[PDB]
Design a protein around this ligand. Structure first.
Ligand SMILES: Nc1ncnc2c1ncn2[C@@H]1O[C@H](COP(=O)(O)OP(=O)(O)O)[C@@H](O)[C@H]1O
Ligand SMILES: Nc1ncnc2c1ncn2[C@@H]1O[C@H](COP(=O)(O)OP(=O)(O)O)[C@@H](O)[C@H]1O
Ligand SMILES: Nc1ncnc2c1ncn2[C@@H]1O[C@H](COP(=O)(O)OP(=O)(O)O)[C@@H](O)[C@H]1O
Ligand SMILES: [Mg+2]
Ligand SMILES: [Mg+2]
Ligand SMILES: [Mg+2]
Lengths: 526, 526, 526
């Protein structure tokens, strides 16, 4: 293969550690309320500004291949943490560096770094245990706004708006975040099954106020093929006029004589029908119409395999919806009836789809919003006066969102970094098997102090003074670095979801303790 | 052809030896419980971490073409050893370097390196004989867990889970290894003939609990062609309703009018049929349907050669299975009846296929799990908090698995480097034909000491003191380098499969003794 | 054309001689029992090691274009020798260098290098004459094993296995050599006409043991076209059931109604038929079916030109074979009856084809292997623990094979190099026409001493002492360089085929004596 070059021992370890230390030093300035932003040049456009540890970490590759190895591993931890939890990234980086440094330094000739890794992992199990003991599950929706506001770097309006969206859509409902055009944040809530397709003809309009087609207790007909009728529609219309309910028709298109029958029966003898084009496009539209089929009940017509033909319809082959509103641009269907079991099965199918599949073909999420819209969905249109502002802010909002979900699903624990600090005594009651493992437990014991000392150091204060003052102080009190003084933590609102504190530590220790095991490094020649 | 450059004798030999020594020095740090890991830069992704000798060896090519010649030969050794045995790679490397060095040093004028090669080969035959004498075939399934745990670098949970899988699937059954998404290891066991294809229609569902089609004592119909026509489907159903058993149908597809008959007779008579698509890849599906044919007892319809047509079926042309379960995604068939002779025939055929040169289109293994699945198969989903961890661990698990298979199929012998150490007296009772052969036997005699010296040296202790203390000590006792003291080897669980100890030595000596014969090296000019 | 640069006289001669001397010096280390190997870097893979003079010679091109001219001429010599004889390559190289040096040195102003060439050519004619006088044709098959073992550099097992294959296949039979996967050598012998195609239907099987169809005294039907019949098949069956003999059918394919007739007549009334696909590759299969036609006695049906149609058969248009065995994978036909004149005519045709057809679409040998000997064909599966070893050993066995064939077809003469040494007195009784020719005869006279002195020099001893000791000693005695002492040559088994000794010398002198005639050399600019 490619010509290569290799390096041995503490020299190579010092190189990789130089890379780790550089990347960590770049990431760590973002930490906490008094933390600061990092600008990253974009190749094509105007530069990014960010406070996100992981996005800083991903941006830094290094010319020196060994230092780049260190860097790659540290961004690996930060990325793993962002994927598994969505916050706690800077923390995962500073922990990873601490374990890597304190690890590397303790290595000698007699030492056994794999066994030291074993000791470290013992220490991490033991700490996350005590963390779970410390966790108190969230209750009041004030705590939600608190977790959001701290994860959003002190922006109260963010955690308020997140609290509102999470109330009105639910704690495990769908909230999504995107650019506003407004200079301010907006919360919009959609209910139903909305998609961007409108009536084919104006003649379908009934209300004259808004120019909408508005129906209730309606039927829905779903056709995967075009309907340029062979009069495959008429039984479907006779069945609708029979049970005196309005009919909405969704199809690849409604065309030719079909439409003529539709707006003749519409303009004359006032029949209640509307027809709209399928959401589109191509193979996606199949999945969408089958989604709406399963949600609203009934069955999709046209060729899948077993072909259900439009000539032979029955009322159990249509669909049933509480309400329908359609305009020139979009169509919304509301309170559609079908098997809820089948709906939760369906969303469980799409999430397990999207989760394994990775082309940034984001429509799989556009599916998920649609079929989950019968609880509701919230769109978070973030404001600001400029694209870069909008992107930084949106990074923070997404962080706070993921943080609130982690808080709701696992728990909350003390903020600042105190939650890890309180776990040290649990390490003090450990029973190491040998010197190596003892070294590992010592490494974790030192590493736990880091996040709090870093948040304080960013403030411009003597962080390690503050750590020890906190340790001397009672369990409920910690350091408010923004206010610049000690306070009850939970009362003042400084709290972190337990899941992120768990995952940052577990990932960071997980890769760094492996990094410390290295004795030989092999890299490509420039 | 290409312009070239040539070098003569011990000058060139010292260069090739420099390459050998570099690669060996890189590989050798991994050896034993106190061994250490090697990081390798990947071109596209985050870097590999490994303890595998062969994967370190393959990663190192060299700019200096002569040193690269040495390197290529040593990685040839490690790769051959990994292919033939699946462990014992680092050992093969350090052995190969020892034979290459001690070889090169002993050549002079008048010396006959070919004849010396003959002597070392004599010595290796003589060693492997005594190794086989030392071999004690495995008995208790504790010994399995011991071989696994030592080959997995002291991870007891690995050898436990391997012991469990090997118990529940059998010692020569199929175990495979794959990534978990879980942070912990999982053992899954599959029974049957599973493949990833589901019922064509929901209407086939029987239980409403799980939404499965569940059958017992059923027949199976196997069609290599599509089944659209009624004409070829109906007799197969009349014969099925005749003997009052459920029928599963596997086909390239089942569609047209056939499907309509299927879900009409399903919904009315309440006939017990299910239909599923063939596992489905071009020419592969033929081999799969032939597999299920042979397993379930019976024959495949459509065109091979002899075409048996679907219109003329007989009960002995179908298939017969104890149970069958189908879902939207997958189909499992269980306790299918056919000639065990013929299925063992099929498995003996596929292994002897796989054994040759169709490369890494590994569905050939996916076949083999299927037709061997009526004993069982085990999936080993290994955990960890990060991809690099998962890959290192999976390397170790695969090592331990191959090691356990080597143990069960051959014998087991003392661990550490002791198994080779005890063979030295067998060299002492040799009768060399001439000085050259005597030099060879001396080379092997020195080389046998090496693995123990390396395992001890990695521990941070005076390895060659330890070797001689071991030689002074009794046959049953050796050095526990992890615990840092001498112990009975077999009692403490430190044991190596004889196959790997045999293959490492045979390959290493095999290539290195050839390397020492070189007098002139010819390389391309830069 | 391309810009060029030219050089005049002994200056340029010294450069070309530098190239010759370099390549020769590289080649000559391989010579004799105490000879040594040469490693050659491969562009794509792991490096070759070889003891083959020609493979060393072809590997060396040179940057200096004049030296490269010399090198190209010497590798021309070694290649010509390898093509014409298959051994004696190193010898041809050192001879060529000796003639080139001794040639170049003796030229002056008054000298006439063309006439000197005439003199050396006289001397070599006179030498090969006396060589043919010395030749004693091979008799005992011990001598075969001796020639093989010596040409294989002392590996007795090689010459044993070659002796066995040559006994069991005949002295002018077909032996071929290829890689084993086994660690040891294997001799396999195939008899018949085997090819890799199996019965179209399992129903054709006769013996439940092995699952074969076994026939004797059978007919053969050969169809170049498909038999989807049309029932052009039936007369061929009526004619077979008439004379109560089994029928094997070879065709492009046999299927449609034909196959149905075949397996109905097989499964009900106990008719003895099999049908198998043509060996099958486009235009190749045509030639193969014509081969089997000619061997089994009878004719191929379908389109050549004159079309013989399947409807009009006669028993003399079929084929007749002593025995036939068919399986799922392969078909073997044995003791087929036809004109031996016509078959040897056919073999004489294909050899004269392949010989001119520099195509490396080498299946023409697969043809030659198919149209079988007398006594059969032998496959030599060479073992070893590694690919490079296998390539070395296979090079040596190919050498020994070619050497044994040269021995049986021309003769054997004294080994060591003595055979050329004994020819010197024949030169002493020559009658040179002029000084130039006398110089030529002197050149050959010195050159004859070289191979023996070189084999001794590789041993580490005073080669030129040994040559003169040999010359003072009797005709039957020479130097055993492996045992390191003088012995009866033929008695100790050290012998060389006369053909290789002839061809090495003739080629070497042939090219080198032309090289010495040069006065100006013209080369391209870098
Ligand atoms: N006023 C505050 N006082 C003390 N700690 C705070 C305060 N505000 C935020 N933090 C801490 O800052 C950390 C979050 O830092 P942040 O910049 O979001 O990095 P990350 O991306 O790792 O979450 C949390 O652990 C939280 O406890
Ligand atoms: N505690 C121990 N004491 C002594 N030898 C050990 C111990 N653990 C493992 N070994 C030895 O280490 C060797 C395995 O080393 P390993 O890193 O797997 O190299 P390889 O990949 O070449 O097998 C085995 O020969 C085993 O006997
Ligand atoms: N034991 C021996 N004693 C003396 N000469 C030997 C012995 N073994 C081989 N030879 C000589 O070595 C020569 C063969 O050398 P080899 O390496 O095969 O060169 P080539 O490839 O040109 O044939 C033969 O001429 C043979 O006589
Ligand atoms: Mg954050
Ligand atoms: Mg191992
Ligand atoms: Mg030879």
């Amino acid at each position: 293969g490619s010509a290569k070059d290799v390096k041995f021992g503490a020299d190579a370890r010092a190189l990789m550690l130089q890379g780790v230390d550089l990347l960590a030093d770049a990431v760590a300035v973002t930490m906490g309320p008094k933390g600061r932003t990092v600008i990253i040049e974009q190749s094509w456009g105007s530069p990014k500004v960010t406070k996100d540890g992981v996005t800083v970490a991903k941006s830094i590759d290094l010319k020196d291949k060994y230092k780049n190895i260190g860097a790659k591993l540290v961004q690996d931890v930060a990325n793993n943490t962002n994927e598994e939890a969505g916050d706690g990234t800077t923390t995962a980086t500073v922990l990873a560096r601490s374990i890597a440094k304190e690890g590397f330094e303790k290595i000698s000739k007699g030492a056994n770094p794999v066994e030291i890794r074993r000791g470290v992992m013992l220490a991490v199990d033991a700490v996350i245990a005590e963390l779970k003991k410390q966790s108190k599950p969230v209750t009041t929706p004030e705590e939600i706004a608190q977790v959001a506001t701290i994860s959003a770097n002190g922006d109260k309006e963010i955690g308020n708006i997140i609290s509102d969206a999470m109330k009105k859509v639910g704690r495990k409902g769908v909230i999504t975040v995107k650019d506003g055009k407004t200079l301010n944040d907006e919360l919009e809530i959609i209910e139903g099954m909305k998609f961007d397709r409108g009536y084919i003809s104006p003649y379908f309009i009934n209300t004259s106020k808004g120019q909408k087609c508005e129906f209730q207790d309606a039927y829905v007909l779903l056709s995967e093929k075009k309907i340029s009728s062979i009069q495959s529609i008429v039984p479907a219309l006779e069945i609708a006029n029979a049970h005196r309910k309005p009919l909405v028709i969704i199809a690849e298109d409604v065309d030719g004589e079909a439409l003529s029958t539709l707006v003749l029966n519409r303009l004359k003898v006032g029949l209640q029908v509307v027809a709209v084009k399928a959401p589109g496009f191509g193979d996606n539209r199949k999945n969408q119409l089958k989604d709406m089929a399963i949600a609203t009940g009934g069955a999709v017509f046209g060729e899948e395999g077993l072909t259900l033909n439009l000539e032979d319809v029955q009322p159990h082959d249509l669909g049933k919806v509480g309400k329908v509103i359609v305009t020139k641009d979009d169509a919304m269907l509301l309170k559609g009836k079908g098997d809820k079991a089948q709906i939760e099965k369906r969303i469980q199918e799409i999430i397990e789809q999207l989760d394994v599949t990775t082309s940034e073909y984001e429509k799989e999420k556009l599916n998920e919003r649609l079929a989950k819209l019968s609880d509701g969905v919230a769109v978070l249109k973030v404001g600001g006066t400029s694209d870069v502002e909008v992107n930084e802010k949106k990074d923070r909002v997404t962080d706070a969102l993921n943080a609130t979900r982690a808080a709701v699903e696992e728990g909350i624990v003390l903020g600042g970094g105190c939650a890890l600090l309180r776990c040290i005594p649990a390490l003090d009651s450990l029973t190491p098997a040998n010197e190596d493992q003892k070294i590992g437990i010592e490494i974790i014991k030192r590493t736990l102090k880091i996040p709090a000392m870093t948040i304080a150091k960013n403030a411009g204060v003597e962080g390690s003074l503050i750590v020890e003052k906190i340790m001397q102080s009672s369990s409920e009190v910690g350091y408010d670095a923004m206010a610049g003084d000690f306070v009850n933590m939970v009362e003042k609102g400084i709290i972190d979801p337990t899941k992120v504190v768990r995952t940052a530590l577990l990932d960071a220790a997980g890769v760094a303790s492996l990094l410390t095991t290295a004795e030989v490094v092999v890299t490509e020649i420039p």
